[PDB]
Amino acid sequence: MLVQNLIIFNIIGIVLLVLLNNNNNGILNKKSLLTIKNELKLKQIGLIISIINILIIIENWIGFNSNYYGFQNIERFLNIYWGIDGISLLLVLLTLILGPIAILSNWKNLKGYYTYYVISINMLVILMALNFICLDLVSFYILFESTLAPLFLLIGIYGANNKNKAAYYVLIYTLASSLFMLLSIVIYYIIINSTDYIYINNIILSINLQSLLFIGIIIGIAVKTPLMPVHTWLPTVHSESPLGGSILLAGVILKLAIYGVIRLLLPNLSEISMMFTPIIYIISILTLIYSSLITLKQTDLKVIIAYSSISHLAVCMIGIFANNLIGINGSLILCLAHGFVSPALFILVGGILYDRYHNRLINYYQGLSTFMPIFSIYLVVFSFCNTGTPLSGNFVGEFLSITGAVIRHPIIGSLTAASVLLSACYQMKLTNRLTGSVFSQYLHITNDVTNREIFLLNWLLIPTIIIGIYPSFVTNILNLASSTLIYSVLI
Amino acid sequence: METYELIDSDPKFSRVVRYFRPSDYLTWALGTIGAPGLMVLFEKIEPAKGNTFKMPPPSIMRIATTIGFFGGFYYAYTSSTKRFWGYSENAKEVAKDRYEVKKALSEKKSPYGSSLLNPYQQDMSARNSTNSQLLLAIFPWFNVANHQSHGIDLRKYYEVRDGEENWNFTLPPLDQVKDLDVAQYKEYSNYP
Amino acid sequence: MDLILLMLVAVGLNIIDIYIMIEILIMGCTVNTIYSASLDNDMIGLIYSLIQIIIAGVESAIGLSILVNYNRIRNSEEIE
Amino acid sequence: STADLYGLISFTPKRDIHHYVIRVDEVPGKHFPTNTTGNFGNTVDFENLEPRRKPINPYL
Amino acid sequence: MIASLAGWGLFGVTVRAYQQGIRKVPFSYYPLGYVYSALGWVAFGYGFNLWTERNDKLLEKRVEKLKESRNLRLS
Amino acid sequence: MLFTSLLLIIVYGSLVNKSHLLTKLINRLGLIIIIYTLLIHLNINTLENLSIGINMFNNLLLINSFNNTIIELILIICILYVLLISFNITGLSIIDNLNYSKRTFIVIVLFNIIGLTLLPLVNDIMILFIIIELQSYSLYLLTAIFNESHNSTKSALYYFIVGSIASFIILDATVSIYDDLGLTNIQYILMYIDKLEIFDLLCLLFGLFIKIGLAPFYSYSITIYSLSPTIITNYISLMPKLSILTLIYIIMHYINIVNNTDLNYVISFLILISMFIGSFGGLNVIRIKTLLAYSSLLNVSYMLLAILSNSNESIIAYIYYIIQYSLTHINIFSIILVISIYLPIMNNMLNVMITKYSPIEYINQLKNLFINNIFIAIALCISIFSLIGIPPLTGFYGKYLVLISGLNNGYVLLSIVLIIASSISTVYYATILKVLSFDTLSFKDIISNNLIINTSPENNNNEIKPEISNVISYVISSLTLIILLIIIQYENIVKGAYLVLLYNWV
Ligand SMILES: CCCCCCCCCCCCCCCCCC(=O)OC[C@H](COP(=O)(O)OCCN)OC(=O)CCCCCCCCCCCCCCCCC
Ligand SMILES: CCCCCCCCCCCC(=O)OC[C@H](COP(=O)(O)OCC[N+](C)(C)C)OC(=O)CCCCCCCCCCC
Ligand SMILES: CCCCCCCCCCCC(=O)OC[C@H](COP(=O)(O)OCC[N+](C)(C)C)OC(=O)CCCCCCCCCCC
Ligand SMILES: CCCCCCCCCCCC(=O)OC[C@H](COP(=O)(O)OCC[N+](C)(C)C)OC(=O)CCCCCCCCCCC
């Protein structure tokens, strides 16, 4: 019911917006009536469609059993089996909640073609949401790569000055790396004749073949989180992509890599994952430490936030490769907490400052608290969330991820605690400068945060603190789903 | 596969046309008028010149009717051929085939007919024409010879089936039937 | 001497000289067919040889017409 | 079932110089245009020809 | 079978509707074009369903032989 | 039907007077002939009956269910191509009159269709040589149909010379085999498959590789496709590959009987080089047809990996890939022919000269297509994304099915190289999309009355005048939606490819 309704309804929504806005192309040269107020009616229809998608997952959430082991809502549609568990359910809801936020963040800061942008946003959201409910490797890859087509055009049309560089980077870094993941999927379909999740989870392959399959998949996953040294696409893509593209990229697209570990590595390549964990920890720890020190020297506001996202997703990778429930739950909570804080920091840095001054150079901004006090409150509040200050979901995710690493590997997992210091070094260096000293001589006094931008900031802050104070809303759903990923034989 | 009884692995041209069903003639007419009709439809779909409908000239309709006439016959020829091959339902054609062969056998005449061709040319002609209908859409080739390579055993005509008792055909042995291989090489083994 | 492509020096420096090389190369195939067919006392090889000769003559005419029209295109002003 | 069905269809049985498919239905040389009886080296008896290898139709 | 042919006709409606955008005409221009397009793909859809129904019958017959072939191998 | 109707059309064309309308109506008669040919062929040839393989015409030809599918594909694609010369592509006489000025255009196509369909059926070395000449000669005559064009004639000269060298190589290979065995029929030669020199068949494949533009012989095809008129380049770049690749598959099916791994290595060397040239070759080019020539070289390398592996998974891969690639090839060239109507007109640096044969010659002539026609621009984006291999488009399943067959046979290197080749070629595929759309916002509010389309008049100023003709628009709409929505019927289509057998049986 879920997948069938989520696809059929959105196709009707896509066709409806095309029919209304393209009925007058034929040398009418008219003035229409939907083109008024920057295509307000067409924007409103797409905004409504995004909210309705959140209602569809809710109807299937009411019947979700947290005390059932296995996939639920098992459905067949387009010759593909679709199912949900505790892990998938939360990631689907996170993906769909950000849909309205992506549209509303670009409500009035596009030069034109609002119908195209709204369709692409709703198209990106559904394809990413469907990626959490597929039940085979090939369906995972189809949805993993289908987002590249709209994302490539979204950046190149609505992007910043270096959009051409950013569009090529996202298309080539992600497509080339995922084709290595396709090689591993083809091998599974050749030797086992199926790519079904449950079917492949029960098969033990030779330790040499598991190594080759792990490397193929990890290449696709490592580029998309991203990890060092294949991370160089992300800062360029984030600084040039539109605000809605940055929100979806920083809120959902990066979380597909962690879900890739949960599906494509842990239950099917269990023996070889234990072998690779020290290598994963070394790569991730250096990803965390290097990205934090590199973030210090950055001079672009939207690139600083982009490098901040890489540091925290290294911690998510460390937690998910811990072989205990504490690390796995911590990595998942950190994924959800990051899914709200990171888009909020892009709205503050690339959606409020950029929409007023159209410059992302750090040297132009200081003392903003004198004439933008409301902006400074949200900037300061989200900065402490971004560094894992307690009472925030980020801390609960970070503390359990660090604890899970220590339990997994006491010696090298202890280096993960540098996230506490290093994240505060670069994040509070930027915030201390935007809110420090006299109001900048290079800026003219203008409006403070508007009602729309207050609304976006409030509804990204609220879930972060609710999860931070009472994470059992999330841990109860994840408890039985996460316990299946642990591999150990104690005697 | 819904296979049927094999009647003739290489039916003669005259037999294929004679065994046309009334639908085969109907499709022959449809092909003949389907070609001028498609020229009208293509003009209706999109006029050749400008934006208004114009009937194609009579000379185009003349050559179109000829093209459709040949196309209609080729379709009907392949429709009737499948019944001989057993690919298509051929219950009516089996009853008609059995009557004609038994009638000719009782007259001590070849069911295939006498040929101007020597033994080599009858064999060669069958090699050239057998299964040639599979490429009748590309280029034509027909069995217009009285050869004996038809993929059937004439002994199956010596058992009376349901609905054949009233025919009262007295069939002689195969060595008395004129112009058959089993009754031809009497004095020499390399000359008929 | 063949492996260093000595035949590339024996071909003349006109487009028509390439045509002659093609005819000679194909004629080598037919001589090999006639030689094998005669030794085997096989008429199927000689039928093949006859087919090669007729077909090789067809492409000689088709190629010549292309070269004929190519030369006409250059002499196109034709103010006379 | 889907995994089982693909395993049957995608399996390629081995071919070597001892087993493969040759599409020849009859022995040649029963008749020649002239001089069918040559050096009497044709030792194949077409009156008592053993049954040929009929091809397999998987859909039958 | 109506449900299958209903979708094929709806595919034909989409084909015509997409064509109107290519030619830059209102989607209400010449409404008979949707009826023509819908029937043309119902006809293709009906032939397509016969093709797939035939394929499943042929596949079963071939699979039976393939299973016997595999049983001999697994020994 | 083809042969009979060709003779009537040959005579009829020479009888009536010469006018553009009459040639256009004669082209429509050619459309009816191919349709009747398809209906007659479908009425008599069925996959279930031809599975065994049936000999025709004294065993000179051999049709099976693998050959039959390609014949129907050739007829279907030839139907789509004739719609280009039988209907208006743009609607403006200065561009469309070219397709109606040659009365022998349809005659040559019918000549070549006969050669295309018979070539996969060849069962004798004598008829293999005859048919490969029949197909080649018609291609030369089609390349030179516009004999008043300097580039068209120059291409036909290059085509004739290179294709004659390949034919001699093909003839030389068959003569060597006849010399070894004294036999001409393929099935008779199969009885001695273990004793003839198998590399005598590699020489036969080498001549076939030249005719499909494989590396290192890729240079002439890239040159010819760029110099020929866009209507000619559409046909000659696709049609020879449908038949020759099918014949190569059948030849490689016989070669795999003896399992000569040295022969497998030489072919793998040619595939490896062609991937490198196909991907890196297109990176620095400015012509769209030169870019598509390298795309053709790259997609042929992908199919040849499936042909080289030559297993049960290879039949499904090759059959599906060739069908979906033909439709993508047809769709792209249809759009390129249409979108010449949006070309700006002067009223200058680099002295760029554009001719009537190829109005769209450079990649940057596709600029602002997202503004001029959004539906067509999206249709072109969908096709280009399919060539890239973006799921769930048809091009994704083509690469997926090719990889399955290649990796199942142990071709680890070629599977990795093609996936690297796919990433490299994505750079120049994306450049098309960058030209189409990336400057939309910085150019949306501009006054463009200098287009070719603006030269057309208006009927009444109260009617609605479609900007693109009916037939060409419906074909682009149909093919684009098939490419986009193949996920709906992918399971049923791939089950059909399971039934296409090449002496599998059991
Ligand atoms: C800037 C953004 C704006 C938002 C900022 C403020 C965010 C809202 C603050 C609250 C956060 C939401 C978390 C509370 C939601 C309710 C959680 C809950 O369900 O409590 C259940 C608890 C035990 O559950 P049970 O025994 O099973 O009985 C209930 C059966 N349904 O049953 C109970 O006993 C309920 C007890 C609830 C106590 C009140 C909780 C409010 C927070 C105060 C405590 C916070 C922790 C103390 C921290 C102080 C600083 C160290
Ligand atoms: C969930 C599966 C959905 C699949 C269908 C995709 C949408 C089809 C759109 C066709 C109609 C059209 O081209 O219409 C154009 C519309 C709206 O443009 P507009 O602003 O009104 O145009 C301007 C007109 N003015 C000037 C009058 C205002 O653009 C879209 O819709 C864009 C969506 C597709 C972008 C991504 C392409 C990726 C291709 C490969 C995908 C894997
Ligand atoms: C401007 C618009 C932008 C895009 C909007 C998208 C609209 C989508 C409309 C879909 C209509 C629908 O529902 O079609 C559904 C119908 C009926 O399916 P069925 O027979 O029961 O098969 C069961 C389907 N399974 C297997 C999923 C259960 O099948 C069709 O017609 C198929 C669509 C044609 C796709 C092309 C491939 C097939 C041709 C083969 C040639 C090689
Ligand atoms: C048995 C099932 C099929 C039945 C119908 C098929 C033939 C239809 C011909 C009707 C006449 C006609 O096409 O008339 C021409 C019309 C209108 O053209 P327009 O662009 O609006 O020109 C403007 C016309 N004014 C000026 C008069 C307003 O074109 C159409 O409507 C195009 C629809 C074509 C459908 C093609 C279906 C292809 C399916 C392919 C599957 C593989």
TrEMBL record, chain A:
Pfam families: Proton_antipo_M. It is found in: Membrane; Mitochondrion membrane. It is an enzyme of class 7 (translocase). This is NADH-ubiquinone oxidoreductase chain 4. GO terms for cellular component: mitochondrial membrane. It comes from the Eukaryota. It comes from Komagataella pastoris. It is a multi-pass membrane protein. It catalyses: a ubiquinone + NADH + 5 H(+)(in) = a ubiquinol + NAD(+) + 4 H(+)(out). The chain crosses the membrane at residues 6-24, 45-64, 80-102, 114-133, 139-160, 167-191, 197-223, 243-266, 272-291, 303-322, 328-353, 365-385, 405-426, 454-473. Keywords: Electron transport, Membrane, Mitochondrion, NAD, Oxidoreductase, Respiratory chain, Transmembrane, Transmembrane helix, Transport, Ubiquinone. GO terms for molecular function: NADH dehydrogenase (ubiquinone) activity; NADH dehydrogenase activity; ubiquinone binding. Residues 136-416 form the NADH:quinone oxidoreductase/Mrp antiporter transmembrane domain.
Automatic annotation (TrEMBL), chain C:
Gene3D superfamilies: 1.10.287.3510. It is an enzyme of class 1 (oxidoreductase). The keyword Membrane applies. It comes from the Eukaryota. One of its GO terms (molecular function) is oxidoreductase activity. The chain crosses the membrane at residues 5-26, 46-68. Its EC number is 1.6.5.3. Keywords: Membrane, Mitochondrion, Oxidoreductase, Transmembrane, Transmembrane helix, Ubiquinone. This is NULM (ND4L) subunit of mitochondrial NADH:ubiquinone oxidoreductase (Complex I). It comes from Komagataella pastoris (Yeast).
UniProtKB/TrEMBL annotation, chain D:
It comes from the Eukaryota. This is NUSM subunit of mitochondrial NADH:ubiquinone oxidoreductase (Complex I). It comes from Komagataella pastoris (Yeast). The lineage of its organism: Eukaryota, Fungi, Dikarya, Ascomycota, Saccharomycotina. The gene is nusm. The chain holds residues 123 to 182 of 182 of the full protein.
TrEMBL record, chain F:
InterPro entries: ND/Mrp_TM. It catalyses: a ubiquinone + NADH + 5 H(+)(in) = a ubiquinol + NAD(+) + 4 H(+)(out). Residues 123-339, 352-424 form the NADH:quinone oxidoreductase/Mrp antiporter transmembrane domain. The chain crosses the membrane at residues 25-44, 70-92, 104-121, 127-145, 157-178, 198-218, 238-257, 263-284, 291-309, 315-343, 369-390, 410-430, 471-490. It is found in: Membrane. The keyword Mitochondrion applies. PANTHER family: NADH DEHYDROGENASE. Belongs to the complex I subunit 2 family. This is NADH-ubiquinone oxidoreductase chain 2. The gene is nu2M.
